[PDB]
Amino acid sequence: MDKAYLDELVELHRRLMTLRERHILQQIVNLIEETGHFHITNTTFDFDLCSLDKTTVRKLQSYLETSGTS
Amino acid sequence: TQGGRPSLIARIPVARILGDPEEE
């Protein structure tokens, strides 16, 4: 087994594809730029999910959970 | 023979995040 990783990535992005918060989206974009791993088009911006690093994926999970002080 | 290994990629037009495609 090993698809586990990819499984999460898919489930994560899937859940986000349902979100409606644009602000949170902006923050994520920065996360992708931080890992300096992505592909920006001269007329568009796209990035692979299976290309990001553990750090990014981790930050994304925390973003959705946004569970800080309670 | 007939496996599966699709690439999960997401496209987000900068015109959405940046909000500056070709002005007006």
* Helix (H) or strand (E) segment spanning residue A20: none
User: Is the CB of residue B8 less than 8 Å away from at least one CB of chain A?
Assistant: yes
Structure tokens at A42: 């001269």
CB contact under 8 A, B17 and A10: no
| Structural domain span for residue A53 | 1-70
In angstroms, the CA A31 to CA A51 distance is 13
Residues 6+ apart with CB under 8 A from A25: A19, B12, B16, B17
Of A23, A16, A2, A1, the closest CA to residue A57 belongs to A16
User: Is the CB of residue B11 less than 8 Å away from at least one CB of chain A?
Assistant: yes
In angstroms, the CA A22 to CA B1 distance is 42
Experimental technique for the deposited model: NMR
Q: Treating both helix axes as pointing N-terminal to C-terminal, what angle do A54-65 and A22-34 enclose, rounded to 10 degrees?
A: 160
A58 and A37 in contact (C-beta within 8 Å)?
A: no
> Residue for token digits 């592909």?
A39
In angstroms, the CA A30 to CA A6 distance is 22
Tally the domains of chain A: 1
Which residues of chain B have a CB within 8 Å of the CB of A24?
none
Give the CB-side neighbour count of residue A16, counting CA atoms within 13 A: 24
